[PDB]
């Protein structure tokens, strides 16, 4: 019944003034991309930065199991688009936010489906 919860631990560590996880691999790109959250190639727009997916996954970086059956990772092998305003903590951003299943944009950072 016991299970380590690193997602809540990282959120509490950030709230107590902890320095965000560093060395996320930022990519060089044109910044004229679609702006979708998780893509097969860097797709950042003018308001985003593109990062290597595995370097932005809390469970990858902490060497712990992913919280789902099959242990599948959404980010490994792909590229995650992070708004430039939040590029200082890519691990925290991908943890706290969700991708829209319709358009593929970050909910609250590009998705305009319910407008």
């Amino acid at each position: 019944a016991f299970a380590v919860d690193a997602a809540k631990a990282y959120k509490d560590y950030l709230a107590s003034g902890g320095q965000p996880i560093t060395n996320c691999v930022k990519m060089l790109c044109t910044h004229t991309g679609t702006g979708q959250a998780i893509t097969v190639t860097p797709e950042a727009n003018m308001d985003q930065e593109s990062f290597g997916g595995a370097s932005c996954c809390l469970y990858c970086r902490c060497h712990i199991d992913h919280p789902n059956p099959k242990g599948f990772c959404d980010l490994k092998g792909k590229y995650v688009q992070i708004p430039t305003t939040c590029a200082n903590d890519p691990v925290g951003f991908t943890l706290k936010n969700t991708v829209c299943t319709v358009c593929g944009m970050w909910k609250g950072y590009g998705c305009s489906c319910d407008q």
Partner: protein, 299 residues
Amino acid sequence: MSSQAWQPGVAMPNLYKMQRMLLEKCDLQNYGDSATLPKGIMMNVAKYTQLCQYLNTLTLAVPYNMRVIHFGAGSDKGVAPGTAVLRQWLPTGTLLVDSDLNDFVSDADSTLIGDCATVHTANKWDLIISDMYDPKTKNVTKENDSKEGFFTYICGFIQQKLALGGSVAIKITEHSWNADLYKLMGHFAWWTAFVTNVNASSSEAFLIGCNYLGKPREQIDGYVMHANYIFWRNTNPIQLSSYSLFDMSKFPLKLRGTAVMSLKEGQINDMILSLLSKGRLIIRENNRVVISSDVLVNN
């Protein structure tokens, strides 16, 4: 300032390859200087980007279901920046395997942890990238002889597991080099030593062999050729530049759809060796990609 500052890097000119220099110490003029990177970009992301930008100018064979293996892909940060650039550069669906002595997280399709000599593959590969480097190799107090170690593995891996028509890019420095690797460059249709503009203050270069032929097209003395490389670096200061990092519109490797054929040794003829030399043919099996790492069991 100079015209090559707008290029991704500088390749060793042909006239320097034809000399018979003796090995000297490498004394770079712009040594100690550093290039100004774009904000937040790691040195290894910039270095790999300029390497791939230069490989875009060559005649690389790019088949469907391409197979690429990347040695020395881990860093002291626990991540793999070079693998991330390779996966961005290579076509979608390319099978990418990377490896390193130390554990790391990467975007590769599969990762092997351990000494490269423990890595075995059943299949052949279309492209081999190596960033392997031992920092203990830089010892200016002792003579600079040809190094073994992972270079011995790389030479054997190329001759056994590189498909005909495939290419390689192997990182070397002044002290991290191997004579047989230079000699193996003569088994490709074309070869060079490429220095990234972003790391031009270092004796580092990438030995690039383009379109593997499986036979010596030219006899290269490895000891003399490394001396020729150092002589070029000693007399040709390269201005540090990150200009090429700001234009990525033409970065992705072009989908060429190079034909893959499975041929016996006797079937190779001059017409097919011509197709290999032009980057229009890959010769290897198209079976499944299977890899493994040997594990030593002890108490």
